Amino acid sequence: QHGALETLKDLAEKEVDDAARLLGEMRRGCQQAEEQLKMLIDYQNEYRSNLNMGNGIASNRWINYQQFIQTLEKAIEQHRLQLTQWTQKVDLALKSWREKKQRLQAWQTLQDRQTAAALLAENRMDQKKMDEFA
Amino acid sequence: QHGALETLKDLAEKEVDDAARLLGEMRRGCQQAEEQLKMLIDYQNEYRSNLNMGNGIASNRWINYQQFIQTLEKAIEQHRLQLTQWTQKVDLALKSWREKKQRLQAWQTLQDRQTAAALLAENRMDQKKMDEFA
Ligand SMILES: [Hg+2]
Ligand SMILES: [Hg+2]
């Protein structure tokens, strides 16, 4: 039953829908990666703003401080990297959706012309039969 | 609430719908005009194929024949003319719909780019805030 344009338009439409969902997944992922990174940086600042006791007595504190900050910075670097990765994925998913969206419009335009051609053909053949016989 | 594109796209969409209904009215009218013309031509042929009695005695028949055929031909000419008028209206309504359909797609394309720009802006501003502070 399908036709030339319709089958191709249907595929393009599906590609568009697929691309939009992919874009949605990438965006949600990028937003979550940023929230996770954000939480770590806040944890860091609160931990810092807080670092205000003794000398060698609170030496264990200086030590704990150094170890933790290094561990936290490590986490922050990895999450920053992850955000960079999600960001790139969003950019690509967005570009992909845009072009498939443009491909779909192109098939839509062809169909509109087909609707035109068909209506025009019907108009001519339905009266040709009774125009000349006049 | 409306925006630049949306208000314009909404108008274009309405123009498209209006044009499609106009096209529908013109097509239905053209189809009916052709059916009416068709009926008359059949009436004519049946009347003719039928014209097969006397001489001066059936003179009233020759007379009736001439008067009726002339009356029918007159009707046929007017209906042929009406069909010509509907046909031209269909052609124009079709052209109008096509271009408004193309105007709508153009506004659709702009909106798609706006969806892109917005998603991209959101992505950048939501992490700018936590990218540098890193
Ligand atoms: Hg993000
Ligand atoms: Hg017609």
Query: What CATH number has the domain bearing residue B75?
Result: 1.10.287.1700
Asked if residue A16 lies in contact with residue A97, where contact means CB atoms within 8 angstroms, the answer is yes
* Count of residues making up chain A: 134
Ligand nearest to the CA of A79: 1
Q: List, as one string, the DSSP characters of B65-130.
A: HHHHHHHHHHHHHHHHHHHHHHHHHHHHHHHHHHHHHHHHHHHHHHHHHHHHHHHHHHHHHHHHHH
Q: Which residues from B are below 8 Å from A81, CB to CB?
A: none
Amino acid at B58: A
Nearest chain A residue to B108 by CA distance is: A105
Q: Retrieve residue A18's tokens.
A: 């697929």
On the CB side of A45, how many CA atoms lie within 13 Å of its CA? 9
The structure was resolved to a resolution in Å of 2.1
State how far Cα B100 lies from the chain centre.
Answer: 13
Q: Which residue has the tokens 């909106």?
A: B111
3-state secondary structure of B55: coil
Longest alpha-carbon distance in chain A:
116
Asked if residue B97 lies in contact with residue B26, where contact means CB atoms within 8 angstroms, the answer is no
Q: Which residues from B are below 8 Å from A116, CB to CB?
A: 94, 97-98
Range of the domain at A130: 1-134
Ligand nearest to the CA of B82: 2
Cα B77 to ligand 2 centre (Å): 16
Judge residue B76's burial from the number of C-beta atoms within 10 Å of its C-beta, 0-12 exposed, 13-18 middle, 19 or more buried: middle
Amino acid at A38: K
Q: Which residues from A are below 8 Å from B20, CB to CB?
A: none
Cα B3 to ligand 2 centre (Å): 42
Rounded distance between C-alpha atoms, residue A91 and residue A114, angstroms: 35
Backbone angles phi, psi at A89, to 5 degrees: -65, -40
Rounded distance between C-alpha atoms, residue A38 and residue B27, angstroms: 63
Q: Which residues contact B13 (CB under 8 A, 6 or more apart)?
A: B104
User: Hey, is the C-beta of A71 within 8 angstroms of any chain B C-beta?
Assistant: no
Q: How many other CB atoms sit within 10 Å of the CB of residue B116? A: 16
Q: Retrieve residue A126's tokens.
A: 């339905």
Q: Which residues from B are below 8 Å from A112, CB to CB?
A: 98, 101-102
Q: How many helices (H) and strands (E) does chain A have?
A: 2, 0
Per the structure, the count of domains in chain B is 1
Rounded distance between C-alpha atoms, residue A87 and residue A92, angstroms: 9
Contacts made by residues B7-12, CB under 8 angstroms, sequence distance 24+? B8/B107, B9/B104, B9/B107, B9/B108, B9/B110, B9/B111, B12/B100, B12/B103, B12/B104, B12/B107
Provide the Cα torsion B82, B86, B87, B88; round to 10°. Answer: 100
